[PDB]
Structure 1
Amino acid sequence: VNPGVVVRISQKGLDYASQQGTAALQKELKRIKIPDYSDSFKIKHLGKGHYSFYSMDIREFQLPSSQISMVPNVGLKFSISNANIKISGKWKAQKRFLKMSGNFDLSIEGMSISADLKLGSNPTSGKPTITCSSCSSHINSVHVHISKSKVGWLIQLFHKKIESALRNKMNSQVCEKVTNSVSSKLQPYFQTLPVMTKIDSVAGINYGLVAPPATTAETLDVQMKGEFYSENHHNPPPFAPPVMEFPAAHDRMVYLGLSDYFFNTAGLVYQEAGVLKMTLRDDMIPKESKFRLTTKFFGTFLPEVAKKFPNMKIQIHVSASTPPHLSVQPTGLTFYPAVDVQAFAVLPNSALASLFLIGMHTTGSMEVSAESNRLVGELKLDRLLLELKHSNIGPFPVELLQDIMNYIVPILVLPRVNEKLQKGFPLPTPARVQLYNVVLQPHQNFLLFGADVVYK
C-alpha cells in the first residue's frame, strides 16, 4: 500500500545521529574494565621474580572522528578512526627481597572501530529495528610510559608478555560495548517514535512503518502509514495515497512528505464522528451590532419569520454536510468546506421550530507552519455561496442571508475552527528531539516538510 507519510533522513541528518551516538558511545567505552596482569619472570642477569601491572583505569578515551556511510540496499557503516585511549595504573615487581612499586602510564592510539548497522521493521508493532551485524576494532601502537625509573626489563616485559593480551581484550571490550549499546540503547530509543499517536478524545494518527527502512545512495527512507484513525469506529478512506517522489536534498537533516491522503483522512474522521457541528445563539454576537438572530431583525427581510413567529430569538445550527477536502498543489493548499446551516425559531417553551435550511460551500487557503514538533495551520475563506434546500416559511431569495452569513461565519464559526488547527497535529518525532529551521514546500499532491533537528 502506498504510504501516507514518508520520512527521508539525509546525510546531514545521519552525521548528526552519529555525533550524538559516538558521544554517547564514549562514556560506555571509558567504563571498560581491563584485568590485572601478574606473572613471574627469570631474566639471565636480573634474576627470578614476580611482576604485576594492575589497578588500571581509563582516564581518557577520545573518539575525534566518527562517520556513517550508507551502503545502498544493505545498511549503515559506522566508523571511528583516530581513537586515543589513555590508561593509567600501578605496577610492582619483586626480585628476592627487593620490592619496587610505582604508577605507570599507557597510551593506546590509532584505534579504528568499524560497525555495521542493519535496519529492519517489526510488522506486528510497526516499530523500526536496528541491530549491529558486525564490529571490529584495531589498535596500532601501545606506548607504555613507565619512563620515571630505570627499569627497562619491566617495559620489555610488558611488550613481550602483556601487550598481546591487553590489545586483544581491549578490542573485544570495545566491540562488546558497541554491539550492546545498539541493541540496548539505540534500538529502544528509535522506538520512541510515535506509532499510534492519540491527539484528542476523537482521533489519533497511525505513524506505523509499512515496510523496512530502505537505505539508498544518499538517504535513509522510512515509509509510514499516515492516516488519521478513529477508535470509536474504524472506517477505511475512499482513496489511495500518492507516490511521493521528491528531490532528495541535504540542506536539512530530515524531510517529511505529508500526502493529501494524510490530511484528508483527518477530515473524514472528524466529520463521521459528528463533531463538526456548532450552535450559534443570539447571545454570542456582541450587544453592539446591527445583526441579531431574532425574528424581529429577520423581519426586515423575511416576514414570514416575524409574521408566524412573533418576537422570538433565532437559533442556527451549523454542521458539515460532507467530509471537507484539502487539495495540495505547488501553488498552495485549498480547502473545500460544505456546511448545512439551519435556522430555528425558539418558541416560548424552548422548543425549536425549523425556519429554513441553507447549503453553504466555499473555497479557502490553508496556510501551514510548525511550532515545537507540531503541524499547525490557519484557514481563510473566500466568498460564501448559499443555496436554499428547504424552507418552512415559503420560497425566498436565498441571497438575503448573504450579509448575515458573512458576519456569522467569519466572526463566530471560523475562529473556533482555526483554534483546533492552530493547536495542530503531532508530528512523527522520536523522544528528546526538536525541529528547527523548517521549510514547507507545497508539491503536487503532497507537502514537503524539511527541517534540522536538535537532540536534547
Structure 2
Amino acid sequence: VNPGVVVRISQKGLDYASQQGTAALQKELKRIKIPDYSDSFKIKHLGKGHYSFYSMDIREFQLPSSQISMVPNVGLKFSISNANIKISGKWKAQKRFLKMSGNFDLSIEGMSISADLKLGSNPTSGKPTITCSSCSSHINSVHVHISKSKVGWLIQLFHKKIESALRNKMNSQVCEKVTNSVSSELQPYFQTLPVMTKIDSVAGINYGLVAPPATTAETLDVQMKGEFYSENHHNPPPFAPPVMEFPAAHDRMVYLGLSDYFFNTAGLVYQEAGVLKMTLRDDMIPKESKFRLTTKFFGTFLPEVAKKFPNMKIQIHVSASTPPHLSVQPTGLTFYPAVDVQAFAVLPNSALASLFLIGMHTTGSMEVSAESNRLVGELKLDRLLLELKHSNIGPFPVELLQDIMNYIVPILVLPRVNEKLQKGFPLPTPARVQLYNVVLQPHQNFLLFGADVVYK
C-alpha cells in the first residue's frame, strides 16, 4: 500500500514506450514468411489451367502510428491503426501449353492490430510480469498490381480464390509475432528493472515491487520497497513509509516519488555499519591552521590538559551514535546531523587517554540532483551547536571549543561526506534507459522527480 519509492508512468511515457516497442515489432513483422498460393481455373487466356502466386517477400511493413491505452484496473491495450504492407513476388499461369509468368506487387491496406497486456508482479522475487491476453488483426483492403496489362483475369482469380485465405493467414501470423514478442522480449526487458541493487561494500537498495503495477485513467504506478539494506543485517527499519499522493501530470514521461523513509533507511544502514566515523590526528590538520592537535597547543586555552598530559599528541574521534534523520518539506530536504566528538591524549605506551566528550549538532540542507541514472547530493551546514557531555580535565565552558570545531568540520569532516554524496546512488532504471528534462518539486514527506526518458 505505501511503498518507499514509487515510479509513476504518464500517458506521455507510455506514448514513448509505444513508439519504441512498435519499432522493435516492425522488424519482426517484416520477417513473416508468407506461404505460396496455387490453384486451378476454367476461365481463359484460354480456358484450362493452373496458376500460382509465390516467393513473396515483405518489402515494407508501415506502422504509421500506434498507441498504448490505459484501461483502468485492467491493464494496457496496444494498438496499431492504419498499417500497410507492401509485398513483392512472382506469379505464373498455364493454359494448355501456354506459359505466362512475371512479377507482382501486393498492397495490404488499412490493417488494424490490437493486443491486451496484463501487468503483474511476482511477490517473492519482486520482479514485474507482462502477459498478452488477446490479440486481433484485421485488414481493410488488398490490391494486386502486375506490369503486364493482359492479366486482369488472373488478378480477378486472385480476389475470388486466394485473397480471403491470404488475409486470414496474414492476420494469424501477425498476432503470432505480437504474442511471441511479449513473452520472449517484452517481459524479459521489463525484468531488467533492478531488484537488490548493490551500491558498495556496505549497502544496497531494495527496489523490488511490493504490489502489481496498477493502471488508472491517467497513471501506471509501480510501487517499490525503496529501502536501503545491509547484506549482514536483517531487521526492518523501526519507522514506516509515508503516504505519497500527487496529481496526475502529463508534461513529463515518468514521476519518481522518493520518500523520506527511503533516505532515512540509508542513514540507518551506514550508521549501523560503523562507517560514519573519522579519526583526526595532528598530521591531518592543514599547515594553514593555527589549531594544532597537541596538549601543548590545547593548553593555551583549556584547564588541566598541558599539565595533566605534558608534550603529548592529541587525537579527535568523530562519530555518529544514532542514525542521522532527514525530513522533506516543500522547502526541500533537510538533514539533522548529530555527532559525538571525543578528544584523547596519546600516552607513552600509545594508549588513548580520554580528555573530554562533547555532542555537536546542526541542521543542513541537502540539495539532490540527477546524473547518469543515479541520484547525487550536496550537504551544506548551518551553525554548529556544541554541548559538553563529560570531562576528565575539570569543568570548562564548551564555547572554548567552538573555533577548532568551526574549522575541523567544513575543512576535514564535511568533505568526506560530500565525496560520498556526490558519488551517489543508483536509480531503478531498466536496460538502455537514461533520464532527462528533470524537474524536482519537494512535497511534504517526499521528493518528486519528473523526467523524460530516452531509450536506445
Is TM-score (shorter-chain normalized) higher than 0.5? yes
Cα deviation per residue 1:323-352 (whole Å; 9 max; x = unaligned)? Answer: 100011111211111111111112244322
Choose 147-156 or 418-427, whichever is displaced more. Answer: 147-156
Give the Cα–Cα distance (whole angstroms) in 2 for the partners of residues 126 and 278 of structure 1. 37
Deviation at 1:183, TM superposition (A): 1.1
Distance 1:222 1:83 in 2: 32
Offset, 1:157:
1.3
- CA distance 1:433–1:193, change in 2 (3 Å): same
User: Contact between 2:76 and 2:116, CA under 8 Å: does it hold in 1?
Assistant: yes
| SS of 2:386 mapped into structure 1 | coil
CA 1:44–1:253: 2 relative to 1, 3 Å: closer
Shift in Å at residue 223 of structure 1? 1.0
Deviation at 1:118, TM superposition (A): 1.1
Residue number in structure 1 paired with 2:346: 346
Q: Check the 8 A contact 2:282/2:294 in 1, yes or no.
A: yes
Per-residue deviation, 1:264: 0.5
* Cα offsets for 1:45-67 (capped at 9, x unmatched): 72222211111000000000101
Residue ranges of structure 1 left out of the alignment (5+ in a row) = none
Secondary structure of 1:312's counterpart equals coil
Q: Could you tell which deviates more after superposition, 19-28 or 38-47?
A: 38-47
Q: Secondary structure at the match of 1:236?
A: coil
State the Cα distance separating 1:44 from its structure 2 match: 6.2
Q: CA deviation at 1:41?
A: 2.2
- 2:14 and 2:151 mapped to 1: Cα distance? 49
- Pairs within 5 Å for 1:298-447: 298-447=298-447
Distance 1:252 1:57, change over 3 A: same
3-state SS in 2 of match to 1:55: strand
Report deviation, 1:132: 1.0
Cα distance in structure 2, aligned partners of 1:62 and 1:420 = 50
Measured after TM superposition, the shift of residue 42 of structure 1 is 2.4
Q: Distance in 1 between matches of 2:20 and 2:350?
A: 65
Residues in 2 aligned to 1:65 and 1:352: alpha-carbon distance in whole angstroms: 74
- Rounded to whole Å, the distance in 2 between the matches of 1:35 and 1:102 is 18
Tell me how far apart the structure 1 counterparts of residues 385 and 321 of structure 2 sit (CA, whole Å): 14
CA offsets, 1:256-305, max 9 Å, x none? 11110111011111111111111111111222321111111111112422
Instruction: State the distance in 1 between where 2:248 and 2:43 align.
Output: 67
Q: Distance in 2 between matches of 1:148 and 1:122?
A: 60
Does the Cα contact within 8 Å between 2:303 and 2:394 map onto a contact in 1? no
Range moving further from structure 2, 89-98 or 367-376? 89-98
Cα deviation, 1:121-142, whole Å, max 9, x if unaligned, reads 1112111111111111111111
- Which residue is 1:204 aligned to? 204
Tell me the distance in 2 between the aligned counterparts of 1:366 and 1:235: 27
> What SS does the corresponding residue of 1:298 show, helix, strand or coil?
helix
C-alpha deviation, 1:421, in angstroms: 0.8
How far apart in 2 are the matches of 1:55 and 1:381? 74
> Equivalent residue for 2:258?
258
Aligned mates of 2:369, 2:211 — CA distance in 1: 28
Cα distance change, pair 45–297 in 1 and its aligned pair in 2 (3 A): closer
- Same amino acid, percent of matched pairs: 100
Distance 1:440 1:278 in 2: 33
Write the distance in 1 (CA, Å) between the matches of 2:246 and 2:44: 75
Q: Quick one: structure 1 residues 95 and 45, their matched pair in 2 at CA, closer, same or farther if it must change by over 3 Å?
A: closer
The answer (yes or no) to whether the contact 2:296–2:306 under 8 Å persists in 1 is yes
Residue by residue over 1:175-200, the C-alpha shift from the partner in whole angstroms, topping out at 9 and shown as x without a partner, is: 11111111111111011111111111
Match of 1:272 in 2: 272
Superposed CA offset, 1:214-268 (max 9, x none) = 1001010111111111111112111111110012101110001111011101111
SS in 1 for 2:148: coil
The count of corresponding residues between Structure 1 and Structure 2 is 456
* Separation in 1, partners of 2:432, 2:295: 57
Rounded to whole Å, the distance in 2 between the matches of 1:196 and 1:171 is: 42
Q: TM-score, normalised by structure 1?
A: 0.98
- Answer whether contact 2:303 2:396 (CA < 8 A) is retained: no
C-alpha separation in 2, matches of 1:217 and 1:388: 58
C-alpha deviation, 1:160, in angstroms: 1.2
Q: Which is worse superposed, 40-49 or 343-352?
A: 40-49
* Deviates further, 410-419 or 349-358: 349-358
Q: 1:149 deviation in Å?
A: 3.7
- 2:11 is the alignment partner of 1:11: yes
TM-score for the superposition, normalised by structure 2: 0.98
Counterpart Cα distance in 2 of 1:402 and 1:437: 43
Does 1:142 find its partner at 2:138?
no
**Distance change in 2, residues 1:248/1:117 (3 Å):** same
Deviation at 1:431, TM superposition (A): 0.9
| 1:51-92 deviation digits (Å, cap 9, x = unpaired) | 111110000000001011111111111111110100000011
Question: Secondary structure of the residue that 1:35 maps to in structure 2?
Answer: coil
CA distance in 2, matches of 1:222, 1:122: 13
* RMSD, aligned α-carbons: 1.2
TM-fit CA distance, 1:174? 0.6
Matches of 1:433 and 1:415, distance apart in 2 = 31
- Map of 2:48 onto structure 1: 48
C-alpha distance in 1 between matches for 2:197 and 2:441: 24
Give the direction of change, closer, same or farther, for the CA distance of 1:45–1:83 in structure 2 (3 Å limit). closer
- Give the drift of 1:353: 1.5
Listed one character per residue, the Cα deviations across residues 141-192 of structure 1 (whole Å, up to 9, x for unaligned) are: 1100014240122111111111111100100011111111111111110111
User: In 2 relative to 1, CA 406–45 (structure 1 residues): closer, same or farther, beyond 3 Å?
Assistant: closer
In structure 2, C-alpha distance between the alignment counterparts of 1:159 and 1:61, rounded to whole Å: 21
Note the C-alpha offset of 1:322.
0.6
Q: Per-residue deviation at 1:386?
A: 1.2
Aligned to 1:387, what secondary structure does the other structure show? strand
Q: Per the alignment, in what secondary structure is the counterpart of residue 44 of structure 1?
A: coil
Distance apart, 1:27 and its partner CA: 0.5
- Is the partner of 1:301 in helix, strand or coil? coil
More off after superposition, 212-221 vs 36-45: 36-45
- Of residues 182-191 and 341-350 in structure 1, the stretch that sits farther from structure 2 once superposed is 341-350
Alignment CA distance shift 1:311-1:303 (3 Å): farther
Equivalents in 2 of 1:103, 1:147: separation in Å? 8
* Structure 2 unaligned residues grouped into runs of 5+: none
